[PDB]
Design an enzyme around this catalytic site. Structure first.
Site, PDB file in Angstrom:
ATOM      1  N   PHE A  28      59.698  53.649  29.435  1.00 27.68           N
ATOM      2  CA  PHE A  28      61.161  53.670  29.421  1.00 27.68           C
ATOM      3  C   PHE A  28      61.657  54.676  28.396  1.00 27.68           C
ATOM      4  CE2 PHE A  28      62.401  50.086  32.145  1.00 27.68           C
ATOM      5  CZ  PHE A  28      61.140  49.583  32.418  1.00 27.68           C
ATOM      6  N   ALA A  29      62.632  55.482  28.788  1.00 27.37           N
ATOM      7  CA  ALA A  29      63.175  56.495  27.882  1.00 27.37           C
ATOM      8  C   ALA A  29      64.673  56.518  28.084  1.00 27.37           C
ATOM      9  CB  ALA A  29      62.538  57.844  28.107  1.00 27.37           C
ATOM     10  N   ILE A  30      65.322  55.652  27.322  1.00 24.17           N
ATOM     11  CA  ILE A  30      66.736  55.306  27.491  1.00 24.17           C
ATOM     12  C   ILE A  30      67.475  55.849  26.286  1.00 24.17           C
ATOM     13  CG2 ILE A  30      68.362  53.344  27.507  1.00 24.17           C
ATOM     14  CD1 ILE A  30      66.881  53.887  30.080  1.00 24.17           C
ATOM     15  N   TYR A  85      65.863  58.105  23.305  1.00 21.27           N
ATOM     16  CA  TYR A  85      64.409  58.072  23.436  1.00 21.27           C
ATOM     17  C   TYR A  85      63.867  59.064  24.472  1.00 21.27           C
ATOM     18  CZ  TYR A  85      63.878  54.035  20.296  1.00 21.27           C
ATOM     19  OH  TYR A  85      63.850  53.196  19.196  1.00 21.27           O
ATOM     20  N   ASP A 127      55.266  51.697  25.274  1.00 18.86           N
ATOM     21  CA  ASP A 127      56.413  52.302  24.566  1.00 18.86           C
ATOM     22  C   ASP A 127      56.298  53.828  24.605  1.00 18.86           C
ATOM     23  OD1 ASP A 127      56.813  49.809  21.871  1.00 18.86           O
ATOM     24  OD2 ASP A 127      57.267  49.641  23.985  1.00 18.86           O
ATOM     25  N   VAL A 128      57.454  54.501  24.517  1.00 22.26           N
ATOM     26  CA  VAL A 128      57.529  55.951  24.673  1.00 22.26           C
ATOM     27  C   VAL A 128      57.410  56.762  23.376  1.00 22.26           C
ATOM     28  CG1 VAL A 128      60.060  56.255  24.515  1.00 22.26           C
ATOM     29  CG2 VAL A 128      58.658  57.756  26.014  1.00 22.26           C
ATOM     30  N   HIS A 182      47.954  44.011  17.679  1.00 23.02           N
ATOM     31  CA  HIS A 182      48.944  44.698  16.886  1.00 23.02           C
ATOM     32  C   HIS A 182      48.254  45.263  15.631  1.00 23.02           C
ATOM     33  CE1 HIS A 182      53.297  44.911  15.457  1.00 23.02           C
ATOM     34  NE2 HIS A 182      52.581  45.319  14.430  1.00 23.02           N
ATOM     35  N   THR A 207      53.803  36.847  13.035  1.00 24.31           N
ATOM     36  CA  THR A 207      55.252  36.758  13.181  1.00 24.31           C
ATOM     37  C   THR A 207      55.649  36.312  14.595  1.00 24.31           C
ATOM     38  OG1 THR A 207      55.416  39.075  13.752  1.00 24.31           O
ATOM     39  CG2 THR A 207      55.625  38.507  11.444  1.00 24.31           C
ATOM     40  N   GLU A 249      58.371  41.142  22.587  1.00 27.48           N
ATOM     41  CA  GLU A 249      57.053  40.921  21.971  1.00 27.48           C
ATOM     42  C   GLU A 249      56.776  39.449  21.685  1.00 27.48           C
ATOM     43  OE1 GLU A 249      55.035  43.745  19.264  1.00 27.48           O
ATOM     44  OE2 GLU A 249      55.768  42.380  17.713  1.00 27.48           O
TER      45      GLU A 249
HETATM   46  O1  UPG Z   1      67.405  52.859  22.909  1.00 25.52           O
HETATM   47  C1  UPG Z   1      66.243  52.578  23.336  1.00 25.52           C
HETATM   48  C2  UPG Z   1      65.521  51.518  22.805  1.00 25.52           C
HETATM   49  C3  UPG Z   1      64.247  51.224  23.295  1.00 25.52           C
HETATM   50  N1  UPG Z   1      63.699  51.997  24.263  1.00 25.52           N
HETATM   51  C4  UPG Z   1      62.364  51.751  24.808  1.00 25.52           C
HETATM   52  O2  UPG Z   1      61.838  50.536  24.280  1.00 25.52           O
HETATM   53  C5  UPG Z   1      60.667  50.844  23.497  1.00 25.52           C
HETATM   54  C6  UPG Z   1      60.596  49.869  22.336  1.00 25.52           C
HETATM   55  O3  UPG Z   1      61.475  50.313  21.289  1.00 25.52           O
HETATM   56  P1  UPG Z   1      60.841  50.871  19.957  1.00 25.52           P
HETATM   57  O4  UPG Z   1      62.009  51.470  19.217  1.00 25.52           O
HETATM   58  O5  UPG Z   1      59.655  51.742  20.289  1.00 25.52           O
HETATM   59  O6  UPG Z   1      60.388  49.501  19.226  1.00 25.52           O
HETATM   60  P2  UPG Z   1      59.442  49.446  17.913  1.00 25.52           P
HETATM   61  O7  UPG Z   1      60.243  48.767  16.815  1.00 25.52           O
HETATM   62  O8  UPG Z   1      58.778  50.779  17.693  1.00 25.52           O
HETATM   63  O9  UPG Z   1      58.280  48.473  18.450  1.00 25.52           O
HETATM   64  C7  UPG Z   1      58.454  47.056  18.436  1.00 25.52           C
HETATM   65  O10 UPG Z   1      59.422  46.664  19.392  1.00 25.52           O
HETATM   66  C8  UPG Z   1      59.086  46.953  20.746  1.00 25.52           C
HETATM   67  C9  UPG Z   1      60.227  46.371  21.561  1.00 25.52           C
HETATM   68  O11 UPG Z   1      60.339  44.949  21.341  1.00 25.52           O
HETATM   69  C10 UPG Z   1      57.715  46.398  21.139  1.00 25.52           C
HETATM   70  O12 UPG Z   1      57.368  46.957  22.420  1.00 25.52           O
HETATM   71  C11 UPG Z   1      56.652  46.800  20.131  1.00 25.52           C
HETATM   72  O13 UPG Z   1      55.405  46.143  20.399  1.00 25.52           O
HETATM   73  C12 UPG Z   1      57.118  46.398  18.733  1.00 25.52           C
HETATM   74  O14 UPG Z   1      56.138  46.758  17.753  1.00 25.52           O
HETATM   75  C13 UPG Z   1      60.809  52.332  23.158  1.00 25.52           C
HETATM   76  O15 UPG Z   1      59.598  52.990  22.810  1.00 25.52           O
HETATM   77  C14 UPG Z   1      61.383  52.866  24.430  1.00 25.52           C
HETATM   78  O16 UPG Z   1      60.334  53.008  25.395  1.00 25.52           O
HETATM   79  C15 UPG Z   1      64.451  53.063  24.784  1.00 25.52           C
HETATM   80  O17 UPG Z   1      64.010  53.799  25.688  1.00 25.52           O
HETATM   81  N2  UPG Z   1      65.681  53.331  24.294  1.00 25.52           N
HETATM   82 MN    MN Z   2      57.965  52.209  18.978  1.00 30.55          MN
END
Ligand code: UPG
Ligand code: MN
Ligand code: UPG
Ligand code: DA8
Ligand code: DA8
Ligand code: MN
Lengths: 288, 288
Positions: free
Chosen positions: A64-66, A69, A154-155, A176, A188, A246
């Protein structure tokens, strides 16, 4: 295909596995429910490549790339070309609110990319938490017709080393990188009994990532449907799990044991955690 | 059932698996194709019992007792009652030329025994080698309708300790107790290229037993059919493999990798090999 008649392997020359030598003595390589934990040195990739190529395996990768991102897509996709399932059939599914911002990336033979337009949610947590719905509800028929396995990641990441068919199995999660050495009380997990994601302090095997899971299409559908339903219940009850999707993924994998577990080689943050001796490879890593 | 919708596990309290502690550091617990090798200390039987009971798993156990080998049935069956799949549904299939010599053994609830009369062959090797045909050709429809897994064993044996659902998987073999520490060149595979069972000196993972193998009904049918066909080819070519059915089973498992491998805990000869430190349990043993 999965579970179709398996043809004979050809003759292969490789080192004999010796029963009175583990290569890996520093880590747990099998769970108590007899799922392999995938670390470097546990698998012969030539044998696995053979087995999965003989099934003409197709792997779907969802990302996902929203909103902002979309900036992460170029490096994600270019490095996936170098390291993800090379030699196998791959279908990337890029979910975005900005189709025109998807970079033009050159793909190797037998690999394809589909852009799927979705709505952007305003809250960060709704974007992250709504992927379960998007994977299950809207894309179920698509994926069943087009791929054998789904890998959901994740992207904001890049591939630095091999990520291949060693991960494929009916259902997998990934340890993790922050918590692989922790005791379960420090995990957590969601701890409020009012949430569907609740896990008591005396339960839990591992702390898995929301950011890297997968399996057969059927098992991924099951996981994503169950997590979506649980998130809807929480929403109706006015509670939001501490770590969002998560937290729900952790509850699901506690109650539905994965058939493989990926070591933290498969999702690492070098800036935050360095490069420990117990990590022989950093395969897929957080972008600083 | 196999591969049907899997209900949620209940809450369970058990020790946390710790990633930076293997229990077993003295042995290889996973093959290079990511199949678990089943040793004591690698599995939590409470978790496995849950998973398989929630599927209402039925296990078939095949045993041949032809000519003088009927004398082994009483101890075999009585000890199986104490140790084999206790708590699960079990169907014993006893193949014999002497139905009236099958001992009257008292069975636990949910367990049944069928006596199947077969022809006795004159040569010892034909008795041992014809089991592949009997399992595949004559009993295929029977087994598909009545059990989820088949376990196929020699009769001149007794159970001394737990043999349970930890062994169940699509396809398994068992490490021969004589050769688990040997290099592949010392394995007594068929070495004549004129036999369908031929394995060159630079090939081979393990030396598996003819006397303890199993899997899903579909996979056991596949194995037994392929071994029967290969034995027929050898017969037509005027060659008989050095270790009979065991040689053909080894060739099959080389080319079709088992999804679990059982340690020699599962078939041991204490009189010949003692009780090594690397064996924490002797589960199923040769009768002196
Ligand atoms: O505005 C946004 C927000 C999120 N994402 C997508 O959602 C993913 C998750 O968001 P991210 O910002 O990567 O979350 P992190 O804080 O890096 O990772 C934590 O949060 C994620 C979402 O709950 C979980 O997948 C991970 O395991 C956890 O470590 C991103 O990589 C994207 O693929 C978007 O495309 N646009
Ligand atoms: Mn991330
Ligand atoms: O007259 C016979 C001969 C054989 N059997 C059956 O066949 C089995 C195999 O014969 P056995 O005498 O037990 O062979 P072993 O020499 O003890 O074992 C070797 O030979 C077997 C047959 O090839 C393989 O299953 C084993 O792995 C291998 O170690 C027996 O247990 C019986 O179940 C009979 O019922 N009656
Ligand atoms: C104990 C030290 C913890 C160090 C890592 C914590 O990571 C964070 O863990 C949360 C669950 O407790 C949740 O998964 C978010 C996660 O943070 C993400 O992943 C890290 C590995 C970093 O990449 C970080 O920037 C990212 O937000
Ligand atoms: C090296 C030392 C070998 C010690 C065990 C040899 O066992 C025999 O192995 C043959 C293949 O090479 C074949 O499987 C028959 C097997 O002998 C049977 O199994 C043994 C474990 C004993 O129980 C023996 O009496 C039986 O005949
Ligand atoms: Mn025997």
């Amino acid at each position: 295909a999965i579970g179709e008649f398996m043809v004979s392997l050809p003759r292969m020359v490789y080192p004999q596995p010796k029963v009175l030598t583990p290569c890996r003595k520093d880590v747990l390589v099998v769970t108590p429910w007899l799922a392999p934990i995938v670390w470097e040195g546990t698998f012969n990739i030539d044998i696995l490549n053979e087995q999965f190529r003989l099934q003409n395996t197709t792997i779907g990768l969802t990302v996902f790339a929203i909103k902002k991102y979309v900036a992460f897509l170029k490096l994600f996709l270019e490095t996936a070309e170098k390291h993800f399932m090379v030699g196998h059939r791959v279908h990337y599914y890029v979910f975005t609110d900005q189709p025109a911002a998807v970079p033009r990336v050159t793909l190797g033979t037998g690999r394809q990319l589909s852009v799927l337009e979705v709505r952007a949610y305003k809250r960060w947590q709704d974007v992250s938490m709504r992927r379960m719905e998007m994977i299950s509800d809207f894309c179920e028929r698509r994926f069943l017709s087009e791929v054998d396995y789904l890998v959901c990641v994740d992207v904001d990441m890049e591939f630095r080393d091999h990520v291949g068919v060693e991960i494929l199995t009916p259902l997998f999660g990934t340890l993790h990188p922050g918590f692989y050495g922790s005791s379960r009380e420090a995990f957590t997990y969601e701890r409020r009994p009012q949430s569907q994601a609740y896990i008591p302090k005396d339960e839990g095997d591992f702390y898995y990532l929301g950011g890297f899971f997968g399996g057969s299409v059927q098992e991924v559908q099951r996981l994503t449907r169950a997590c979506h339903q649980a998130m809807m219940v929480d929403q109706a009850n006015g509670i939001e799990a501490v770590w969002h999707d998560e937290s729900h993924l952790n509850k699901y994998l506690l109650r539905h044991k994965p058939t493989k577990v990926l070591s933290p080689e498969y999702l690492w943050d070098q800036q935050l955690l360095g490069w420990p001796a117990v990590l022989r490879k950093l395969r897929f890593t957080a972008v600083p």
